[PDB]
Design a protein around this nucleic acid. Structure first.
Length: 190
DNA sequence: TTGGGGTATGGGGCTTGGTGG
DNA sequence: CCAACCAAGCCCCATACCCCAA
């Protein structure tokens, strides 16, 4: 917003080199994947004489000195609550990434999904047949019926809840053993 | 020791509304 | 706190590499 205007850190010499080289390379090699071209460019980097590298190096060092000056000038023109909301935007960012990363890894270790509630299993069935525009509305409809149902009409759902509760228990046990075997006691409950 | 950040894109998943480890 | 139930078009991202600031 105002922090979106925060000066960015310069990227390093290999990154510069690559950024410039990609374009040249893709133009000489239309039928190729980026990943490949990148591998190719990295090799070029390795190959490049130190005296040449040193050129990009100096570019980066001087570009860092600009960042130094830039960031501090930036901070002065900000209020203290601003200075803080900045630092928080950074932390929040980093934590979201950490979050995403652990969530990917669990899914890739096929970690059992949590027990679905009495209400969950109802929604998973009475959503196709539901009035409304967005999902917001298609939901309030199913919500209204939830209040309007009674004990007898909630059996085969609360039954499947109680079943899924035992599915969870079993699946969680298979998975936690699996994990112990794979050297990861750390992903265990408690 | 770690990880972010440059690209481009092919598969990934976070979002908006009101019951459960 | 965060995950679960229903969308799907945008948020993000690992991938190929290297390097240096935190």
């Amino acid at each position: 917003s105002v922090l979106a205007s925060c000066p960015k850190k310069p990227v390093s010499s290999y990154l510069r080199f690559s950024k410039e080289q990609l374009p040249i390379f893709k133009a000489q090699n239309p039928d190729a994947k980026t990943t490949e071209l990148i591998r190719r460019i990295a090799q070029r980097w390795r190959e490049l004489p130190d005296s040449k590298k040193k050129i990009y190096q100096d570019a980066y060092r001087a570009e860092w000195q600009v960042y130094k000056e830039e960031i501090s000038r930036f901070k002065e023109q900000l209020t203290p609550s601003q200075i803080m909301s900045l630092e928080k935007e950074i932390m929040d960012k980093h934590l979201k990434r950490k979050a995403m990363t652990k969530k990917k890894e669990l899914t890739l270790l096929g970690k059992p999904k949590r027990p679905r509630s009495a209400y969950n299993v109802y929604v998973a069935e009475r959503f196709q047949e539901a009035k409304g525009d967005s999902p917001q509305e298609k939901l309030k409809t199913v919500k209204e019926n939830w209040k309007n149902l009674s004990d007898s009409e909630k059996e085969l759902y609360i039954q499947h809840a109680k079943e899924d509760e035992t599915r969870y228990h079993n699946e969680m046990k298979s998975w936690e053993e699996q994990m112990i075997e794979v050297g990861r006691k750390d992903l265990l409950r408690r």
